[PDB]
Amino acid sequence: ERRQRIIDAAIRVVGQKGIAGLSHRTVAAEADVPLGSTTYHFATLDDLMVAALRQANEGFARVVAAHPALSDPEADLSGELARVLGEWLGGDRTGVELEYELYLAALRRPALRPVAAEWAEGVGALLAARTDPTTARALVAVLDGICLQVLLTDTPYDEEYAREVLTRLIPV
Amino acid sequence: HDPERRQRIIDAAIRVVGQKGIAGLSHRTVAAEADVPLGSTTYHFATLDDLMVAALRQANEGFARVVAAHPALSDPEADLSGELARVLGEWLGGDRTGVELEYELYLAALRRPALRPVAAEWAEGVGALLAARTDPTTARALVAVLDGICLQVLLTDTPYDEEYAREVLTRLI
Numbered sequence: 001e002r003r004q005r006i007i008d009a010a011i012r013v014v015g016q017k018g019i020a021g022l023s024h025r026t027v028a029a030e031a032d033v034p035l036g037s038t039t040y041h042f043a044t045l046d047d048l049m050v051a052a053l054r055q056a057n058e059g060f061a062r063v064v065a066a067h068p069a070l071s072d073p074e075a076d077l078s079g080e081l082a083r084v085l086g087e088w089l090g091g092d093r094t095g096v097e098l099e100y101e102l103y104l105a106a107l108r109r110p111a112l113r114p115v116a117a118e119w120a121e122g123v124g125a126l127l128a129a130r131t132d133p134t135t136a137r138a139l140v141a142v143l144d145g146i147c148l149q150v151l152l153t154d155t156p157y158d159e160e161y162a163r164e165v166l167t168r169l170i171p172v
Numbered sequence: 173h174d175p176e177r178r179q180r181i182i183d184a185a186i187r188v189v190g191q192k193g194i195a196g197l198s199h200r201t202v203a204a205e206a207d208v209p210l211g212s213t214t215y216h217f218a219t220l221d222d223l224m225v226a227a228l229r230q231a232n233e234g235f236a237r238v239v240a241a242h243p244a245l246s247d248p249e250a251d252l253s254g255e256l257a258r259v260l261g262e263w264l265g266g267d268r269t270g271v272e273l274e275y276e277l278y279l280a281a282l283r284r285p286a287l288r289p290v291a292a293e294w295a296e297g298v299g300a301l302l303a304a305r306t307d308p309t310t311a312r313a314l315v316a317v318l319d320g321i322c323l324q325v326l327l328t329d330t331p332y333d334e335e336y337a338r339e340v341l342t343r344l345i
């Protein structure tokens with residue numbers, strides 16, 4: 001209800017101000033509601049942060065939801081992944097940056113650990129179901145390193161590189 | 173050029189980030205740590221981004237210090253994946269104060285353009301060693317998967333499995 005009107009205000013405030021610009025006052029302003037209602041639904045910011053990311057996590061589903069080849073016996077997995085991956089990182093990255101920002105905030109924010117471990121959740125499940133539970137962790141580990149390389153160092157996205165390295169891990 | 177005060181300024185910035193992270197990192201915070209004035213801390217590093225860039229590059233020079241400490245990484249016979257996975261399990265030796273603060277600096281670039289240059293030097297230490305012992309493309313993935321394997325452990329309190337890390341790294345060779 002309001003948790004919603006105020007949650008989208010958190011993703012809008014991080015996307016814009018980055019975590020550092022997120023405070024109850026900060027979101028209460030976006031959501032356009034009283035300071036006491038923001039504080040009500042979310043006692044601490046860590047809660048209003050898991051809310052934010054737990055909702056973001058969804059988006060990843062909707063995505064796999066849209067591409068069938070991912071759950072398809074053949075197609076590929078690697079080509080499909082490299083492909084769709086270049087999409088999410090395509091052009092304006094205000095979305096991925098807020099998502100990664102939060103997810104990585106689990107480095108020093110304990111409350112944010114459980115949600116963080118629910119990252120690839122939207123594929124980590126699928127991959128281990130398509131392959132094994134050692135290749136699942138693997139693939140998500142390559143994706144992370146591959147995505148961190150682009151976002152943190154200005155290196156452009158190399159889809160063939162990624163489509164190339166993803167295969168090596170996935171056995172036959 | 174007032175070098176020693178500046179050394180202890182960068183020395184405190186790391187201490188600060190290690191026990192308080194970036195959240196509690198700023199001129200007042202570092203100046204109080206190094207025990208320097210403050211206009212001294214701002215004198216050497218105009219922006220915070222400046223000190224962060226600095227702190228990072230100094231800690232990250234230890235990576236080149238270990239790659240040297242294990243010549244076996246170059247032995248063209250030696251199993252790189254295993255050696256790579258072992259020295260890594262070493263860097264992760266408990267209460268990763270070293271690791272946690274470096275990566276936090278490394279990852280801060282996500283939203284700070286100024287930190288993107290040092291963020292490009294994160295795996296510079298093993299650079300010549302990976303170019304000469306594999307290929308440029310296999311080379312990038314080792315890093316990508318090393319950073320990936322590292323996030324799982326730091327971001328989710330799950331423990332490092334060198335044995336799992338040697339298989340993954342191998343699968344790419």
Ligand SMILES: CC[n+]1c(-c2ccccc2)c2cc(N)ccc2c2ccc(N)cc21
Pocket residue numbers: 056059060063081082084085086088099119120121123140141143144147
């Ligand atoms: C959860 C982030 N994440 C990952 C991802 C990155 C690193 C490790 C695991 C998954 C991803 C990976 C591939 N190949 C293709 C699309 C996405 C994606 C798409 C949308 C979104 N909103 C988050 C997304």
Ligand SMILES: CC[n+]1c(-c2ccccc2)c2cc(N)ccc2c2ccc(N)cc21
Pocket residue numbers: 231232234235238256257259260263270274294295315316318319322
């Ligand atoms: C620069 C961080 N880093 C990496 C590393 C982590 C992820 C990607 C690339 C390199 C590393 C990787 C291996 N195998 C062995 C030791 C280290 C290491 C040792 C010390 C340090 N201070 C930073 C270190």
Ligand code: NI
Pocket residue numbers: 067084087
């Ligand atoms: Ni598509």
Ligand code: NI
Pocket residue numbers: 241242259262
């Ligand atoms: Ni050693």
